[PDB]
Amino acid sequence: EGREDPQLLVRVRGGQLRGIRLKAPGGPVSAFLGIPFAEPPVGSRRFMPPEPKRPWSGVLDATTFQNVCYQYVDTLYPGFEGTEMWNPNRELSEDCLYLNVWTPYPRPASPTPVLIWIYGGGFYSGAASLDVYDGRFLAQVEGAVLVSMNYRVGTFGFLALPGSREAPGNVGLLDQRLALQWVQENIAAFGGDPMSVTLFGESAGAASVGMHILSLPSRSLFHRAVLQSGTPNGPWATVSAGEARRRATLLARLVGCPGNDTELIACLRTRPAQDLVDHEWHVLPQESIFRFSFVPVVDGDFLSDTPEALINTGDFQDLQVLVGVVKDEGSYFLVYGVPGFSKDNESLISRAQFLAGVRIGVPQASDLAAEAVVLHYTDWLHPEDPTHLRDAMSAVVGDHNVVCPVAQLAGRLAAQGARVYAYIFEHRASTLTWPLWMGVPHGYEIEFIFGLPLDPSLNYTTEERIFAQRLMKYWTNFARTGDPNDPRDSKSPQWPPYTTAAQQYVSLNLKPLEVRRGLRAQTCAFWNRFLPKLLS
Amino acid sequence: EDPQLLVRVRGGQLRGIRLKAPGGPVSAFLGIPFAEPPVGSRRFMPPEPKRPWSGVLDATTFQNVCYQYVDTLYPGFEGTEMWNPNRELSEDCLYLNVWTPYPRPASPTPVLIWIYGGGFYSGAASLDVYDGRFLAQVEGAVLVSMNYRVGTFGFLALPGSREAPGNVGLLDQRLALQWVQENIAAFGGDPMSVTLFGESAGAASVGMHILSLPSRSLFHRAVLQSGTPNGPWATVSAGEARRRATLLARLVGCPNDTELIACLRTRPAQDLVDHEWHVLPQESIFRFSFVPVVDGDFLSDTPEALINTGDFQDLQVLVGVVKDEGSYFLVYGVPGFSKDNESLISRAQFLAGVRIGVPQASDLAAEAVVLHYTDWLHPEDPTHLRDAMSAVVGDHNVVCPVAQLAGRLAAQGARVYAYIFEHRASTLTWPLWMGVPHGYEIEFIFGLPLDPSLNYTTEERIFAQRLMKYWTNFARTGDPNDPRDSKSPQWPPYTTAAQQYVSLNLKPLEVRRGLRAQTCAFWNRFLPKLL
């Protein structure tokens, strides 16, 4: 010390860190990457809740991203940006409990609102190091303190033998909670305000944000929340204690593990990480799409009851939520799983293929429930039309898994005291490599919220750069005040809060804000009110 | 003595009356007997052909109206009184009426046979709305209308019994169709070009003549206005007919079939009318006590089975509905509804109404109805709930059974033409919320706006003329389109692929696609699966 940049030297509870000065289009940013927040969850610690990281001696280098949590790498379309952009960009390791911090350069003089990003990837994949989650633009342009963490995914994060000591479940959510705890204690050293923390996430990340809202020990660690294309409630974000027990026992059999839970978990702990990844998908109860094997469990601990019971009975008076969806939530889920669908053709399907797809898309549906889905989504004027059937299939999956669980959450939070702001993202990136029939697929709003169009080397249009700047302003104004609206800008269209009376939401596209009413109201009344009665 | 008023039919000589229509005279032969009076021992029995008479039979006045329940709900109210009997009630009522141009046509003329509605418990061929004089004068048509037995008299059945076999009111109708074949040529009518037309229970009757082989040889074309043989109200099973006749017998103090039927035959007509409504299995609306029975005789199977398996290649059918089929059915039966207030109902009142409107519906089926018809943007809005209640009743009872019939006839070889009547008579005394209620297109088809004393607008007179042309062109050719009008828009046939129908209102024809397609997929495909 003494020859290095004094603006990049910081101390945390665990010790000294050395960060890196990064270039963002408009100027420098301070980045502290790969900070350890927990004891490596390896060996005897596999399946166990995280332990806080013991202090270190000397200056820890925090200039590079750390290991990505052990997961299944997508090799479906080799060289394809559409799939490769989501793949791990660092080495896979069980030693992965690290977090990243981006702050303005020089570090802010007064306490600054903090944004904590929780990534998606069906609770089996993801990393905080991906290029779409780059906090440098938000830190530079908006002056934000951005934090992102790695949490255990798959069997490593969510394999549960409910009631056991050794594998209690939801440990990946506890990794997230420990990083929220770390922010409270240490973010002030970076110029961050621990008294103004906003959680934001997408897909499984949004479901994770939702589970922090529904779990009392997490509520003291944040003030506001953003749930993008994901919710704690719904058909995929959780499993029962019985279902998690079933899936962990089946995986144990599959890898040669046999009679109490201690014996079974000890044997699972001797298995190489890849053996577990190789059998992960083989525990699903049916042929399905938008279903993940190891997800949060309703344990009676982290989740005191189902997220459905919790959202219907909870008091959310003190809460501000920003929720929303993309135009085509379900389109991507059809390419691996539904026969007749491909990214390399227009995917014009037959009626038989549509009926077959509804059984895959709604796997828990009875013959009668699936018929109600088919009859609702058929256009009885053109019941055999291949383009309509193709789109209806996308809508079934999108509506069942995302839009209607989002509408249900917005409705319940608003009715029970929260301040809700709802959106629909309708802009398809000019740079998208997925076919046009897929529209705006699941996760393709992220690059805009994070401000990637501001980098001139990424070849986005001028319109897309102005639009990204607009979105970065909505998100950070929401983090700052609990309202996405700019107080100085009187002229710009206001984003009204979502209410049960008016059911107002906005469209996020290249045009100025548009206020719309009812988030897929007739269709979501079918999924949220009728279909549960067709489970009797 | 006018030679244009003396006709010799197989039963003997008749004398009509020269009537005045706006444009000129018409010949009318009213109250012609077509059957032996169905009185005494003949009560509940199939009709017998009328024995010949001596001299010249007077046919200058309408005859007795078949014995029925008279609506006394709103006394002096045009809205209800226009449907009430306008002649004396009697069991001696099997008479028909004939209207022809004056002088009688020189060449054989297409015949239109009108079959009235009234839930199979009421109606008469003598009502002012069924006046054939305009169609006879303006279009040169030979119009025939008959009285058929209604209520217990026409449809009380002890299935399998010889003395009360059921469907005798439909046999009264069939005998009048037989009479037309045998005698219409004496009036200048073409027995080889006979079109049946009817509304509500009359349309369901027309539909039952299509589905019953011995009737099929008596007509060539058909018009089903706001009614169908299929659906929840037009028929009952042999079992249901049996319990209702047994219950009614018990209610009037009666007493095996022979014994029970003989006791019923000793009862005065009004004693049977007094208990008629008390045999319905639930609190319901758009449900009638004595209706056609699936006997395995007149109806060889249910109208559903018959419409799904029938060959209709040789048939031309004109079908349609009115804008607000169910609105009227809500005033007597559904709490919160009235003709004297705007009927803005609550959510509770709507859920309660769905149980009355869909009486066969289980708790789950009724919930599916509620969830489908609720506007989830305004789920508590009283105007939406009021209007949704009207739609439930109209869709369940008329629009979706009509869509189902049109789809099946088209798929199985018929030529079908479908419409929606959206014009509300300027003269209507029912409140505005009721819109275009059940039966208010009839006065337009019959050409009543052409009479200047009835106070209809000029627009309504041009519109009635248009409709009279559609109906008579359909009777003439099996196509409602005018070959004279070498201008657009043409009325396309309804097909299962294109699902084309037209709107009948003051504006020129508009071609629309799918008759409430999504909603009727719910009633016709999903709801039957519950259970």
Ligand SMILES: Nc1ccc2c(c1)c(-c1ccccc1)[n+](CCCCCc1cnnn1CCNc1c3c(nc4ccccc14)CCCC3)c1cc(N)ccc21
């Ligand atoms: N060997 C084997 C054996 C059995 C099965 C499988 C493979 C695979 C598979 C195929 C290709 C790549 C990865 C997994 N899937 C398909 C699983 C579908 C996962 C889709 C998903 C859901 N959340 N993240 N992902 C993948 C991660 N990538 C994405 C992510 C996001 N959006 C995306 C948009 C397009 C393309 C990829 C995206 C937003 C959030 C971050 C992750 C299965 C699906 C089922 N139901 C059963 C068995 C298997």
Ligand SMILES: Nc1ccc2c(c1)c(-c1ccccc1)[n+](CCCCCc1cnnn1CCNc1c3c(nc4ccccc14)CCCC3)c1cc(N)ccc21
């Ligand atoms: N004393 C007693 C005991 C129990 C019950 C009743 C009466 C009455 C009743 C009330 C007034 C008049 C007649 C019957 N209704 C209600 C029945 C409503 C029948 C509605 C109907 C169906 N088809 N024709 N009509 C009546 C005839 N009038 C009309 C007709 C048509 N359109 C109309 C439009 C508006 C008003 C009247 C119209 C087109 C076809 C010709 C007949 C009941 C209904 C139920 N469900 C149970 C018991 C009774």
Ligand SMILES: *[C@@H]1O[C@H](CO)[C@@H](O)[C@H](O)[C@H]1NC(C)=O
């Ligand atoms: C698209 O490709 C898949 C896989 O090759 C195939 O099953 C499907 O039938 C194709 N669809 C069209 C419309 O060509």
